[PDB]
């Protein structure tokens, strides 16, 4: 009363958060990744179940079940492909979705942001466990190195690891409980995603110009619902193009060899989305240092909101910051590459540098350029 789209305790929601939702008349395409990320999640979960319905978490059959799934299940193979890569497409999207936020300072919406961070952290973790299920050589050695990371904490260190593996070294108990983990985590993401979005809706979306937009807003529908269906198909093309024309481009082949707890492969690299971390962990030559540098390499995101010094919100109007921003991006691109390379000269030193420069651009060059900038506007 009047219409059944604003008084229905359910229908009102899809209409209160997806149709009548007021949106800046001017948000760009870097605002699309939001949805994609969502569509990405829901999509992974589907291929995920479908898959889980044929996998068998147990060292002596993990590997073979995945192959049987590919070879004997109707379209199984395809179903894996979509899942295996969706993960990437996922990480890709999330990455821009984070850069978008950095550039236009969405990070001023603290809660909406912090949740975001948690979300990232979970996705990261999620992919980690998923990757181990196929019980391949990497799966193993990955599962063996990553968990071992916690052994860096003193006292509760070595001991915490035990729970993880559920043993005194990676074996079945690890695999099966990872499968549980993997099955569960996604849902938690979907859950927090709800908080994430729900926090955002108290403030409305930010926008490229970094100034009030009340002066002109438009209904998500059909302005952004349409803008998004398109955005989805523009990103969906390459991702399908890979998973249909070059399935193994992004994937290491070493993981086509059944785990062997006796031989760690010579050429060991984690999947691309973990390289920058990898590089940093490898930059500091100390168990703890590397871990810590790592820990902060991501945990630093929590600080970005308190390292904002510019009187303006977005970089659109701060060329200096802009150049520094793109320098940071590229800086990251390098770190990744470095991770792709073995520990040798020049790489070691290059890695070491890039890290220093990463942390420095965030902790000192941004707040410093930011201030300077203000004084050059006469504020």
């Amino acid at each position: 009363a009047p219409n059944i789209r604003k008084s229905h305790p359910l229908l009102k929601m899809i209409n209160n958060s997806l149709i009548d939702l007021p949106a800046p008349s001017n948000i760009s395409a870097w605002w699309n990744f939001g949805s994609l990320l969502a569509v990405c999640l829901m999509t992974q979960i589907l291929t995920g179940l479908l898959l889980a319905m044929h996998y068998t978490a147990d060292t002596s059959l993990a590997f073979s079940s995945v192959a049987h799934t590919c070879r004997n299940v109707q379209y199984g193979w395809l179903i894996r492909n979509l899942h295996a890569n969706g993960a990437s497409f996922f990480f890709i999207c999330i990455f821009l979705h984070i850069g978008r936020g950095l550039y236009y300072g969405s990070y001023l919406y603290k809660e909406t942001w912090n949740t975001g961070v948690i979300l990232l952290l979970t996705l990261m973790a999620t992919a980690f466990v998923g990757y181990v299920l196929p019980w391949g050589q990497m799966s193993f050695w990955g599962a063996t190195v990553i968990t071992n990371l916690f052994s860096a904490i003193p006292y509760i260190g070595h001991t915490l690891v035990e729970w993880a593996w559920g043993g005194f070294s990676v074996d079945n108990p690890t695999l099966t409980r990872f499968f549980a983990l993997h099955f569960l985590l996604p849902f938690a993401i979907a859950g927090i995603t709800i908080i994430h979005l729900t926090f955002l809706h108290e403030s409305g979306s930010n926008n490229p110009l970094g100034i009030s937009s009340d002066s002109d807003k438009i209904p998500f529908h059909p302005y952004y619902s349409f803008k998004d269906i398109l955005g989805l198909t523009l990103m969906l093309t390459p991702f399908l193009t890979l998973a249909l024309f070059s399935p193994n481009l992004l994937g290491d082949p070493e993981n086509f060899t059944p785990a062997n707890p006796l031989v760690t492969p010579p050429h060991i690299k984690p999947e691309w989305y973990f390289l920058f971390a990898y590089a940093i962990l490898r930059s500091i030559p100390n168990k703890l240092g590397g871990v810590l540098a790592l820990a902060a390499s991501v945990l630093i995101l929590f600080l970005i909101p308190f390292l904002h010094k510019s009187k303006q919100r977005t970089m659109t109007f701060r060329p200096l910051s802009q150049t520094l921003f793109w320098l940071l991006v590229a800086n990251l691109l390098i770190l990744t590459w470095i991770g792709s390379q073995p520990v040798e000269h020049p790489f070691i030193i290059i890695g070491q540098m890039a890290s220093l420069s990463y942390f420095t651009i965030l902790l000192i060059l941004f707040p410093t350029i930011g201030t300077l900038e203000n004084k050059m506007l006469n504020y």
């Binding site: 192959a67 302005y223 269906i229 398109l230 193009t241 249909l244 024309f245």
Partner: protein, 241 residues
């Protein structure tokens, strides 16, 4: 050996994003596997039924699979008994376990060749060169007794004796069994064996690209169409005065 020689890029008849495997070179490659590799190399994830509709006829496969005695059972007394092979069996292991194989190949383990094509950096390009590329150690290199030289193999000391030589077998389709002609066919087989979908995978890809082209454009319209209203829009500030 901090150094390594990488392989070249042969133009496999199926390399192109629209190129199906050479279903004939595959049928041959197979024969090469069945008559040469299947004496040291296992193929656990492939089975005679897989061949049907791809390289062999139903009738052929049945016979093919019957050329082997498999271990079924227990019976009614509880004894394991041998029996002829059915299309539903997988390719027989040449050994009962890795421990055995090693012992019959000088401590070296000839890895199952189901996913081999996808498990070595280089794929069919590498597998080809390893097979053909066998040669003599250059100046200053001593290859341990039992190991042969191969510049393509990492460490250059490979425990596999050069498996092929002209006429080592004779294709039933009347094709020149030269060393490479075989190595080409067997490498081609491995691919099929490693990802049987391959064909139907690329066929869809095409279809995808076609819908994806059409549909993406069709939507570029409907996005603009609706948005036009805001792009063409004009505003003016008219105070009181």
């Amino acid at each position: 050996g901090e150094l390594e020689l990488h392989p070249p890029a042969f133009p496999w008849s199926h390399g192109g994003p629209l190129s199906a495997l050479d279903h004939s070179s595959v049928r041959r490659g197979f024969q090469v596997y069945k008559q040469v590799c299947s004496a040291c190399h296992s193929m656990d994830y492939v089975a005679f039924r897989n061949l049907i509709g791809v390289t062999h006829t139903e009738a052929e496969a049945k016979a093919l699979a019957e050329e082997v005695e498999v271990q079924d059972g227990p019976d009614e007394n509880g004894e394991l008994f041998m029996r002829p092979g059915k299309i539903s069996d997988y390719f027989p292991k040449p050994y009962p376990n890795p421990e055995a194989a090693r012992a019959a190949n000088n401590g070296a383990l000839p890895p199952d060749l189901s996913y081999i094509v996808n498990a070595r950096h280089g794929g069919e390009d590498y597998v080809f060169s390893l097979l053909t590329g066998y040669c003599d150690p250059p100046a200053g290199v001593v290859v341990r007794e039992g190991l042969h030289y191969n510049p393509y193999f990492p460490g250059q000391a490979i425990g596999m004796a050069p498996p092929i030589y002209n006429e080592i077998l004779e294709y039933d389709d009347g094709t020149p069994a030269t060393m490479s002609q075989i190595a080409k066919d067997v490498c081609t087989f491995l691919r099929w064996a490693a990802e049987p979908e391959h064909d139907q995978r690329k066929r869809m890809g095409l279809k995808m690209l076609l819908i994806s082209a059409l549909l993406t454009s069709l939507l570029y319209y409907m996005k603009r169409h609706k948005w036009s209203v805001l792009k063409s829009r004009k505003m003016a500030y008219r105070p009181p005065k």
